[PDB]
Design a protein around this ligand. Structure first.
Ligand SMILES: *[B-](O)(O)CNC(=O)c1ccccc1[N+](=O)[O-]
Ligand SMILES: [Mg+2]
Ligand SMILES: [Mg+2]
Length: 466
C-alpha cells in the first residue's frame, strides 16, 4: 500500500510537462512522522506564493491571532469654539484592510468632534514603515498590476478582497469612432489620465491595453474597444498609496462638511507636537480574520505589510531587513530548521526567495501543533470549493475528486515556478505535503500537482463526491 502510492507518484512525475524541471516532492504523515514520499526534498527552489506559508506563520507567532491595526487622524490641539485646526494628519499603522468606507467613517468622526475647517494642509503619514516601496529585484514591467503594488503603512484597500494600493479602472465603449470613456476610480483626480483608446466598430477586435508607464503616476489607455463589448474593469496600482489615501481623505472630509483650505501631501506628525489631538481612529479586524483574504487569494500587499509589521514588533523598524530576520527568528522559535531558506520577501513575488520541500513540510508540521493551528488552516484554500472565500485559488481545481473539500493547500505560480503545499486529513492520518516545481517550460504543471493531491486524498481514504 505504501509502495503502490510511491509507484503512482513516481509515474505522475513521469509527466512530459515536467521536462527539464526540478521537482521537490515531499509527503509526511503527521501523526507518526513517517516519511511516506521524498524526492529532491533538500533541493533549493523558488517558492512563488508558497513563501506566504512562512510569512503567515511568523505573523501569528509575532503579532498573534488577536492582533489588530490602527489608523488615526491627528491635529496639534483640539478644534476651537470656532471649530478650527491648522494642519491635519492621517496616520496609518499598517492596516492592510483600510477601506474607503473607513476613511469616510473617520471623516465623520473628525466632523463629530467639532472640526468644521482644516485651515492648514492635510498630511498622509505612512512613516510607521519605511518608504522602500518595492523589493529590489521585483520586475519594473510588473509594477502596474495589483500583486505588485507599492508598500506603505497607509494604504487604501479596494473591495472585499482588500487589494491594497490600487484603483479600479473601467473603460466603457461609446459610439463607434469616439473615444472610449475611461473612469479612473478612487484615483480620479490623483492619478493622471492618458486616454488614447477609441471605440471600434461593433463586432471588431478588442485591443484595449490599460497600463501605468514605469516611473509615472499616469494611467495610459490605448487600443480599441468594440462598440458592443462589455465594459472592462482592471485593477491598476498607483504611485504613493498614502498620497492616494490622503487624496481620498480630503474628499471624505469635504463630504462630511469639513473644508480643507490647504494642500494634500506626505508628512509625518511633527516631533515638536506636545500632545497630539486624536480626532478620529479606526481599528482593523484581528489578524486571524485578516488571514482569510490574504491566504485564500494570495495577497502580496498583505504579505509585505505583515513582514514590515513584524519588523515593527521585533525592533520598531517597519522594514524588510528587520522583518525578514523577524520571520526567520520566529520560524526557528517554532522548531523549523531554516537552513535551506533564503528570505527576500514575505509574498514570494521575489525571485531571490528559496525554499526546499522538506522545509515546507517541516513548517506544515510545526504549524499543526501551534496554538494558532486552526485559524491557520482555516486561511488555506480548500480544493474545489466554489465559494471564493473558501476555495480561493483552489476554487476551480480538483472538483469531483477525493481531494474536493478535504485538501487544504497554498498555491504558487509565476514563469517556470509552480507550487502546491498543505494538508490531506483523513480516516488514516493528517498528511502534510509539498510540491515545488521549477524550470518547466510550458504552462504550470497544475494537473500534475492535482494528481498527487488527489492520490494522497485517496490514500488517506477519501472518495470523489458524486
Ligand atoms: B504567488 O501568487 O504564487 C506568486 N505569484 C504572484 O505574485 C503573481 C500573482 C498574480 C499575478 C502575477 C503574479 N506574478 O508573480 O507575476
Ligand atoms: Mg478623487
Ligand atoms: Mg472527501
Amino acid at each position: 500500500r505504501l509502495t503502490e502510492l510511491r509507484e503512482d507518484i513516481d509515474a505522475i512525475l513521469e509527466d512530459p510537462a515536467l521536462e527539464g524541471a526540478v521537482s521537490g516532492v515531499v509527503v509526511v504523515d503527521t501523526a507518526t512522522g513517517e516519511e511516506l514520499y521524498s524526492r529532491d526534498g533538500g533541493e533549493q527552489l523558488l517558492p512563488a506564493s508558497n513563501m506566504k506559508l512562512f510569512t503567515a506563520a511568523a505573523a501569528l507567532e509575532v503579532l498573534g491571532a488577536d492582533h489588530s491595526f490602527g489608523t488615526e487622524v491627528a491635529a496639534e490641539s483640539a478644534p476651537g469654539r470656532r471649530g478650527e485646526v491648522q494642519d491635519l494628519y492621517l496616520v496609518g499603522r499598517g492596516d492592510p484592510t483600510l477601506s474607503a468606507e473607513d476613511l469616510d467613517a473617520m471623516a465623520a468622526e473628525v466632523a463629530a468632534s467639532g472640526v468644521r475647517t482644516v485651515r492648514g494642509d492635510l498630511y498622509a503619514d505612512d512613516t510607521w514603515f519605511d518608504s522602500e516601496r518595492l523589493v529590489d529585484d521585483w520586475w519594473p514591467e510588473d509594477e502596474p498590476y495589483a500583486y505588485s503594488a507599492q508598500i506603505s503603512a497607509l494604504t487604501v484597500a479596494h473591495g472585499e478582497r482588500f487589494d491594497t494600493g490600487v484603483t479600479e479602472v473601467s473603460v466603457t465603449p461609446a459610439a463607434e469612432g469616439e473615444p472610449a470613456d475611461v473612469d479612473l476610480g478612487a484615483a480620479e483626480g490623483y492619478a493622471e489620465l492618458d486616454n488614447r483608446a477609441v471605440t471600434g466598430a461593433a463586432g471588431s477586435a478588442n485591443t484595449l491595453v490599460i497600463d501605468r508607464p514605469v516611473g509615472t503616476n499616469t494611467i495610459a489607455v490605448t487600443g480599441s474597444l468594440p462598440a458592443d463589448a462589455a465594459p472592462v474593469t482592471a485593477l491598476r496600482t498607483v504611485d504613493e498609496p498614502a498620497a492616494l489615501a490622503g487624496h481620498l481623505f480630503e474628499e471624505a472630509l469635504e463630504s462630511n462638511g469639513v473644508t480643507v483650505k490647504g494642500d494634500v501631501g506626505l508628512g509625518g506628525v511633527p516631533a515638536d507636537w506636545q500632545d497630539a489631538e486624536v480626532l478620529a481612529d479606526h481599528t482593523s479586524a484581528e489578524l486571524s480574520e485578516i488571514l482569510v483574504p490574504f491566504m485564500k487569494f494570495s495577497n502580496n500587499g498583505h504579505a509585505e505589510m505583515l513582514v514590515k509589521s513584524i519588523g515593527q514588533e521585533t525592533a520598531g523598524a517597519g522594514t524588510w531587513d528587520a522583518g525578514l530576520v523577524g520571520v526567520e527568528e520566529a520560524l526557528s522559535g517554532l522548531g523549523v530548521d531554516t537552513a535551506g531558506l533564503v528570505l527576500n520577501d514575505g509574498s514570494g513575488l521575489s525571485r531571490g526567495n528559496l525554499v526546499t520541500a522538506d522545509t515546507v513540510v517541516d513548517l506544515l508540521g510545526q504549524a499543526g501543533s501551534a496554538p494558532w493551528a486552526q485559524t491557520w488552516s482555516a486561511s488555506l484554500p480548500v480544493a474545489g470549493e466554489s465559494d471564493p472565500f473558501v476555495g480561493g485559488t483552489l476554487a476551480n481545481r480538483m472538483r469531483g475528486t477525493a481531494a474536493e473539500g478535504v485538501v487544504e493547500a497554498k498555491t504558487g505560480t509565476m514563469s517556470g515556478v509552480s507550487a502546491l503545499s498543505g494538508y490531506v486529513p483523513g480516516p488514516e492520518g493528517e498528511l502534510a505535503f509539498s510540491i515545488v516545481n521549477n524550470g518547466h517550460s510550458g504552462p504550470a504543471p497544475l494537473a500534475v500537482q492535482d494528481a498527487i493531491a488527489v492520490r494522497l486524498a485517496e490514500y488517506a481514504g477519501h472518495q470523489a463526491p458524486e
